[PDB]
Amino acid sequence: LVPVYIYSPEYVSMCDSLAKIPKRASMVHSLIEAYALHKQMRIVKPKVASMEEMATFHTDAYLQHLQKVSQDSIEYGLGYNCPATEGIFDYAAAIGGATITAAQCLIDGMCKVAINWSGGWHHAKKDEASGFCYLNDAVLGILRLRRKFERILYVDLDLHHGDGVEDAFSFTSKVMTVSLHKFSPGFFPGTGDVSDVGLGKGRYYSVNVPIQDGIQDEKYYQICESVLKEVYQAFNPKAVVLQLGADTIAGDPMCSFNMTPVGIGKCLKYILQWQLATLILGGGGYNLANTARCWTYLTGVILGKTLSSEIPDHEFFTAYGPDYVLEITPSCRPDRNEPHRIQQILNYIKGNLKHVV
Ligand SMILES: CN(C)c1ccc(C(=O)NCCCCCCC(=O)NO)cc1
Ligand SMILES: [K+]
Ligand SMILES: [K+]
Ligand SMILES: [Zn+2]
């Protein structure tokens, strides 16, 4: 009954090697640990994903190519965004197996919530890398949950549209994907408008909520709670995979949304309250200190605790200036979401869900 935490020194050290988020893994860990939150969690060492576990989603041509490259390259999306970095195959296997490992505990009753903050790589296609994602651990995690669960719900709270995971299940009704991302022409990955609902046997089993800059905690929680309520109704899931990219939080260099760890928490609370199994994943988050602040605070609402406002002294204390507090103050930027558009969106979504059995 104690939340599982996927950690291991070798793992975190492996993740700190990710180009875009250097040392972000350590920062998140050490901050969560400096709050002694790991004392109230079942620490589980992550297992490396095997070539056959990754093959449950990715093609051999892709996986083998990714492997040879790990030692004509821009063939499988391995270009500007996803470079042919030496050792990526090993980094992705570690992160992928870290989610497979967390998924297994959920289908073992060993816990009702497993956490893998270093995961959440939602852009990767079965045979294509995208948006710094070489392997789609979110899909590998959901496919593992399918061993014991019939209806799995995937909620993507990342600033970006979880296309990789949506594409994976766009033709199926066994897994429903919900994504609240910023949608605007020329913004990555450019998909996910509200009209996007899935194909074939999976029509309407894909929900997309396009948002605009500036949105804040309450405006966001209303939209999220609203959509998550209608969804639990029609789909009535058995397990839940939650992607919590912190690139929505105020202060991120992404400078799009204007959330705080508490806005997301209200959403997290609302989902945890369904008492269904739950696989927590990180994702984007480009303001290192803030990301540790957000996920630590969230590892706090997962344990019903209320963390200390003053940031405990630790390994990376200095990176928490100039105030050294766990709270994030929203930026003074205008919300660009006209309330009428949010309604048209919510209705269109509402009428898209009636079609569910
Ligand atoms: C200043 N500089 C060198 C850059 C600035 C912006 C990008 C970018 O937006 N790239 C597009 C990829 C967006 C990240 C998607 C991964 C993600 O956040 N998933 O949730 C790249 C480089
Ligand atoms: K689907
Ligand atoms: K999203
Ligand atoms: Zn993102």
DSSP labels, 55-88: TTTS-HHHHHHHHHHT---TTSSTTTTS---TTH
Distance (angstroms) between ligand 4 centre and the Cα of 10 equals: 25
Q: What tokens appear for 81 in the block? A: 């965004």
Contacts of 232 (CB under 8 A, 6+ apart): 153, 274
Residue 182 CB less than 6 A away from ligand 1 = no
- Closest alpha carbon to 260 in 329, 313, 207: 329
- Separation between Cα atoms, residue 307 and residue 322, nearest integer Å: 19
Strands 4-6 and 114-116: parallel
Fold classification of 1-357 is Arginase; Chain A (3.40.800)
Which atom of ligand 1 lies closest to the CA of 162?
20
* Domain regions of the chain by residue span: 1-357
Given resolution (angstroms): 2.7
Pocket test for ligand 1, best of 188, 249, 256, 281 (most atoms within 8 A of CB): 188
Per DSSP, which regions of 184-309 are E strands?
206-211, 239-243, 277-281
Strands 42-44 and 175-182: unpaired
In angstroms, how far is the first alpha carbon of the chain from the final one? 33
Residue 128 CB less than 6 A away from ligand 1 = no
What residues pack around ion ligand 4 (CB closer than 5 A)? Answer: 158-160, 245, 247, 284
Q: Which amino acid is at 27?
A: M
Chain breaks in the chain (C to N over 2.5 A) after: 71
Integer angstrom CA distances of residue 22 from 10, 84, 224, 293:
15, 17, 31, 16
Q: How was this structure determined?
A: X-ray
- Measured torsion, CA atoms of residues 118, 238, 125, 169, in degrees rounded to the nearest 10: -160
Dihedral angle sign, alpha carbons of residues 85, 138, 98, 284: positive
Residue 160 CB less than 6 A away from ligand 1 = yes
Residue 81 CB less than 6 A away from ligand 1 = yes
- Separation between Cα atoms, residue 340 and residue 343, nearest integer Å: 5
283 close to 121: Cβ distance less than 8 angstroms: yes
- Closest alpha carbon to 65 in 54, 57, 73, 55: 73
Annotated catalytic residue 123 = yes
Q: Which residues make beta-bridge pairs with 153?
A: 176, 240
Q: What angle do CA 174, 177, 179 make, to 5 degrees?
A: 175
Q: What tokens appear for 58 in the block? A: 């990715």
Residue nearest (by alpha carbon) to ligand 1 atom 14: 131
Residue nearest (by alpha carbon) to ligand 1 atom 21: 81
> How large is the angle between the packed helices 137-145 and 88-106, nearest 10 degrees?
30
Residue nearest (by alpha carbon) to ligand 1 atom 20: 284
Task: Spot the catalytic one: 58, 65, 122, 123.
Answer: 123
Q: What tokens appear for 91 in the block? A: 């980094």
Q: What tokens appear for 43 in the block? A: 């620490």
Q: Which residues make beta-bridge pairs with 240?
A: 153, 278
198 close to 206: Cβ distance less than 8 angstroms: yes
Contacts of 177 (CB under 8 A, 6+ apart): 154, 156, 162, 165, 166, 169, 205, 206, 207
